[PDB]
Design an enzyme around this catalytic site. Structure first.
Site, short mmCIF file in Angstrom:
data_model
loop_
_atom_site.label_atom_id
_atom_site.label_comp_id
_atom_site.label_asym_id
_atom_site.label_seq_id
_atom_site.Cartn_x
_atom_site.Cartn_y
_atom_site.Cartn_z
N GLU A 207 0.80 -1.22 0.00
CA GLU A 207 0.00 0.00 0.00
C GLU A 207 0.84 1.27 0.00
OE1 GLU A 207 -4.16 -1.56 1.40
OE2 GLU A 207 -3.28 -0.18 2.87
N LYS A 340 -15.87 -2.05 0.30
CA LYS A 340 -15.08 -2.64 -0.78
C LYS A 340 -16.05 -3.17 -1.83
CE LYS A 340 -11.18 -4.09 2.13
NZ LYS A 340 -10.50 -5.28 2.72
MG LIG Z 1 -9.01 -4.23 7.09
#
Ligand SMILES: [Mg+2]
Ligand SMILES: O=C(O)[C@@H](CO)OP(=O)(O)O
Ligand SMILES: [Mg+2]
Ligand SMILES: [Mg+2]
Lengths: 431, 430
Positions: A207, A340
């Protein structure tokens, strides 16, 4: 009408294949890429040929778009502006609860690309189109970026069990200023990790954050505290955490292991683990904690929710599933949803999950996956949902920053018609 | 004509501001982002930074953005130049700056307008950018897709560690297609990263600025052995070659005329040339970039005379036609690393490629260590018929977006395109 639906295989930020879908109408070509994580989650379709990409191919999901979904959607001839009817038809084609027939990655690709086709037909950008779908009010709210700057858990070498440590620039007057503040703090942190843990401590993770050998959570929080002070933003920048506690929950004994080679006496009950969270939140400016307890440890969540005034974000607990969300509401387990879109499979179901959360005065943090692409759809999603919170990685690696750059373009485009969420990010939908 | 030219500040893959320019015509908006280097050369075009140490550590580009919005933008619109005549556009941009190194208005301000106008010129033609670039460069058909030189093991100023050499790359040239070569690199990269963790700890799995793994190793022999083992595990031994970007300007103590292989027992240029010859005879190394300093012309010629592999100039030539002319006359190298932001405009970047082709050089279109979601160099590599591109490891999307773009070009062209393969050094005449 739709003249062409075509899918292909592209590589995500980890070097693994993923689905990219094209939808062509009179207004041009409309393209979307599906993310991928590393649960009651939507079933993404992988080839499983261990001689090709290590079994992570998506030729089958691409073929399902080209041969099955595409031609069927064109013949059905649904208005591209009617996202509900489009996604309803996509789920009818699949016909399974977890989208295991056609693949969640194949369905979402068509779903998001058709959404951009519907936006283009309306002559408006995607975030304005999503605001119409979700029924969010004006002016638009720009999200506070939850920027992951240091990583532990299974993605580090130390004994640090917590997975993600983020900085929250909520006191900035603008999204643009919040980005510069976060960027400057990140540079001070990377230099601190280098000087304190060695030159290799500056190499980033998936990330974009660093992950040196850290042993305790306070050691990680102290390092973030020191980086914020050097940049001169103490008190104006907050801290968030994603514990990812499902990684170290021993279900057989209902105990949490903070060193998941360990001892059997320090294994924390959820009452003991909550005391550590409460102690950290009383010492550091921690305003949001994600997945503090396991994905099915409902009793621990409700125990933690009863006494906590900060944000309690569900991710693996909720998997963007309205069924899990309804249960989390009824049991008073969390007060925020990590959204998500590829956890549920369609944009319509993703919007519905956000609406179900808003109905309980939850916060919604639109999130990325650990495997991202150059696609910036979630940037328009966070703006269109009036969520006021986005989580898309460090100010490093372009699969993370392309989202933030897109909001900069949205910020500049809207001007006065957009306000920064600020400290009201937990209630931005009603700001 | 041009209706609007607007610039803004965006963040690159390192978290530093850079310039993005929009150009709107009748065909719509056309956008380009300027890259930024870390291991920059001394002779590169001048990149304008704000220098305000209280904002982005002094790395803001508000002045370069302003120069586009208040100076370059209004000047180009009034001149009313055909958007397809890239030469007149870039000539006009240099007339406004009026300096050789593009100091005045900023090379990052000039390049953003140059690349955005180029995309606007292609759209008026109704063709993709790589086709428009092929017209500007005079390259023949069919189109040639480049061999991806993938920097899978980062070092030098691109990653934290003790490794002196900057880039260790794999070269999938035996593959029958660009698509298969990309799969091979992704599979080798997964074998390398798992091998780096097992051999050097989980910390070795973290990546550098260009997506490659950064193990804490000392010698280049260790990195080459690690890449060799990863290629064998993936089953592509003999089908994937190895390339290096030494970036030896970073560790050339010019006073003593020596190179420091531990710049984070120094060698002369003869001793450093012996090291290269020993590694090239031991490993399938087919291309070495910047083996000697940016102004160590004697060392380049000494090494060029005895070497049959590709010798790529980067900080030596900085995509500058004047530096390229010197390297040709002195027989210093046989390939150019083309960085558009080293020279400042697309026309000068194209002219740098053509001058290299005249001496039968190879041309490797390259990214910068600080990249963005912009994918212009993908169309540049295909448009120049260069047959080789350097845009990072198959990791971090600022690297793969260029690779994904070539995949779309590959599918779009079909049989109208051919993979460069083993002929990457001579792909322009392939
Ligand atoms: Mg998480
Ligand atoms: O040296 C190079 O070849 C480039 C690309 O790898 O790196 P930088 O932009 O830092 O000069
Ligand atoms: Mg997880
Ligand atoms: Mg170089």
């Amino acid at each position: 009408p739709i003249s062409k639906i075509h899918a292909r295989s592209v590589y995500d930020s980890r070097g693994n294949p993923t689905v990219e879908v094209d939808v062509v109408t009179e207004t041009g070509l409309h393209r979307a890429i599906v993310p991928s994580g590393a649960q009651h989650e939507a079933h993404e379709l992988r080839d499983g040929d261990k001689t090709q990409w290590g079994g992570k191919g998506v030729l089958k999901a691409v073929k399902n778009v080209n041969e099955t979904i595409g031609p069927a959607l064109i013949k059905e001839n649904i208005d591209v502006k009617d996202q509900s009817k489009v996604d309803e038809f996509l789920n009818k084609l699949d016909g399974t609860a977890n989208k295991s027939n056609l693949g969640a990655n194949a369905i979402l690709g068509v779903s998001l690309a058709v959404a951009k086709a519907g936006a283009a037909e309306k002559g408006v950008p995607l975030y304005a189109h999503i605001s119409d779908l979700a029924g969010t009010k004006k002016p638009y709210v720009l999200p506070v970026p939850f920027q992951n700057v240091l990583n532990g858990g299974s993605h580090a070498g130390g004994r640090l069990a917590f997975q993600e440590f983020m900085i929250v620039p909520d006191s900035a007057p603008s999204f643009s200023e919040a980005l510069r503040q976060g960027a400057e703090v990140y540079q001070k942190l990377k230099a601190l990790a280098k000087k304190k843990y060695g030159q290799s401590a500056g190499n980033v993770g998936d990330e974009g954050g660093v992950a040196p050998d850290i042993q305790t959570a306070e050691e990680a929080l102290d390092l973030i505290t020191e980086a914020i002070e050097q940049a001169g933003y103490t008190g104006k920048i907050k801290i968030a955490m994603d514990v990812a506690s499902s990684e170290f929950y021993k279900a057989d004994v209902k105990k949490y292991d903070l060193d998941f080679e360990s001892d059997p006496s320090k294994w924390l009950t959820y009452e003991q683990l909550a005391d550590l969270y409460k102690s950290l939140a009383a010492k550091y400016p921690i305003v949001s904690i994600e997945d503090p307890f396991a994905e099915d440890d409902w009793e621990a969540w409700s125990y933690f929710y009863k006494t906590s005034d900060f944000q309690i974000v569900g991710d693996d607990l909720t998997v963007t599933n309205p069924g899990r969300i309804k249960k989390a509401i009824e049991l008073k387990s969390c007060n925020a949803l990590l959204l998500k879109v590829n956890q549920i499979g369609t944009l319509t179901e993703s919007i519905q999950a956000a609406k179900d959360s808003y109905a309980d005065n939850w916060g919604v943090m639109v999130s990325h996956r650990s495997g991202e692409t150059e696609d910036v759809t979630i940037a328009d999603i966070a703006v269109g949902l009036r969520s006021g919170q986005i989580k898309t990685g460090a100010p490093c690696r372009s699969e993370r920053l392309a989202k933030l750059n897109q909001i900069l373009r949205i910020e500049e485009e809207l001007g006065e018609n957009a306000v920064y969420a600020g400290s009201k990010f937990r209630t931005a939908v009603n700001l």
